[PDB]
């Protein structure tokens, strides 16, 4: 029931501004505090600021302050985070977090977190990915794959058989090419007996370019 939805991943030019939303559902937004946390590539969690959606008061981190502006719309039950003058160092995954009071203990704790929103600070244009199948030439286990080549920005979401086939799936992290475009492969290991008797479709999805591919590997 208690959920913390977040807006889709965004790409912005260096020097511009980005506004990320946080949809609160399954609990009264006014009853808690909302935090924003920046998570740099592979680096530690960095707290940005807190808002009291009920009154509006804000407490920002001394380094983030002046560039971060947290807003909240109680009627729409959503919290927003605006970050301007975007530098290459601002390219990270941003998380919104619910902080609830615990009556029994008499303390407050940052319990629930949002799924996260990736911010890409780049000059390169938004491009849809080229999907290619990965089937070999001619033992028990047989490997099939999908090559999500040449795309910008990150990320892409690869499913198999509309989310039915989950076991054996290995979607590797995207590798940044010299071309400046990203690329990742998604492999799935299935037995030879089941092969030729079942359809094997990979469900590629790139939301920034509104690309949606459903390629069958044979």
């Amino acid at each position: 029931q208690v959920q913390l939805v977040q807006s889709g991943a965004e790409v912005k030019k260096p020097g511009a501004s980005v506004k990320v939303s946080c949809k609160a559902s399954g609990f009264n937004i006014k009853d808690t505090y909302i935090h924003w946390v920046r998570q740099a590539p592979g680096q530690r969690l960095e707290w940005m600021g807190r808002i009291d959606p009920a009154n509006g008061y804000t407490k920002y981190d001394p380094k983030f302050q002046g560039r971060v502006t947290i807003t909240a719309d109680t009627s729409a039950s959503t919290a927003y985070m605006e970050l301007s003058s975007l530098r290459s160092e601002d390219e990270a995954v941003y998380y919104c977090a619910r902080e609830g009071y615990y009556g029994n203990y008499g303390v407050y704790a940052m319990d629930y977190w949002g799924q996260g929103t990736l911010v890409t600070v780049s000059s390169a244009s938004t491009k849809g990915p080229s999907v290619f199948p990965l089937a070999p030439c001619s033992e028990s286990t047989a490997a099939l794959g999908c090559l999500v080549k040449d795309y910008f920005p990150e990320p892409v979401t690869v499913s198999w058989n509309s989310g039915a086939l989950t076991s054996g799936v290995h979607t590797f992290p995207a590798v940044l090419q010299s071309s400046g475009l990203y690329s990742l492969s998604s492999v799935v290991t299935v037995p030879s007996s089941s092969l030729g008797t079942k359809t094997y479709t990979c469900n590629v999805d790139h939301k920034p370019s509104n690309t949606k591919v459903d390629k069958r590997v044979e």
């Binding site: 794959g145 090419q177 492999v187």
Partner: protein
């Protein structure tokens, strides 16, 4: 503005081992300490808050301790599902997170299942060729991929990407991608992939001849 010193930075322990992480602060944080579980590519989950209070739903094996400056987090028996980056949070005055702890499972050697994929006919139409090698489910993380186009060793033409440790069998999966033009690809016949791993006795090669 209170500083965080989370030790260790990373660890590897067998399924069942008593994992111990510490988080020392610059000044007294009066027991206002919390611990978060960040499983690969997921939102951090609150395990323990106020030094020792366990969140409803979190397993019994997870526990916290400490007072003042020195605080300690403990997993009584490490599980294959405990693969994550663990962080310590102070919330006395302002909010500061720790450096993190890379928690991986230490297990017996698993040989990689090698697979060679040729460039598709649709990719060749665009005037480019991408040959993919796969190293499905292996342990430890250390693996050597030697690309060979007609007995000629390829260096620089390749680009590899490894996955996080698996949630179930606690193994890794590596994918090395060799790139060439449709012209350079048509000039050669045999495309090999020499996998050197601890799980394999001799360096296993999985190739294909063009056509």
């Amino acid at each position: 503005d209170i500083q965080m010193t989370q030790s260790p930075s990373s660890l590897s322990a067998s399924v069942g081992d008593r994992v111990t992480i510490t988080c020392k602060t610059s000044q007294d944080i009066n027991k206002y300490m919390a611990w978060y579980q960040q499983t690969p590519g997921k939102a951090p989950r609150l395990l323990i808050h106020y030094t020792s209070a366990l969140q409803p739903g979190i397993p019994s094996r997870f526990s916290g301790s400490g007072s003042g400056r020195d605080y300690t987090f403990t997993i009584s028996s490490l599980q294959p599902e405990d693969i994550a980056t663990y962080y310590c949070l102070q919330y006395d005055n302002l909010w500061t997170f720790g450096q993190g702890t890379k928690v991986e499972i230490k297990r017996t050697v698993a040989a990689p299942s090698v697979f060679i994929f040729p460039p598709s006919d649709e990719q060749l139409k665009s005037g480019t060729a991408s040959v993919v090698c796969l190293l499905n489910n292996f342990y430890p993380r250390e693996a050597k991929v030697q690309w060979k186009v007609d007995n000629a060793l390829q260096s620089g033409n390749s680009q590899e990407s490894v996955t996080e440790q698996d949630s179930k069998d606690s193994t890794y999966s590596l994918s090395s991608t060799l790139t060439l033009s449709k012209a350079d690809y048509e000039k050669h016949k045999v495309y090999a992939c020499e996998v050197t791993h601890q799980g394999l006795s001799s360096p296993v090669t999985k190739s294909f001849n063009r056509g």
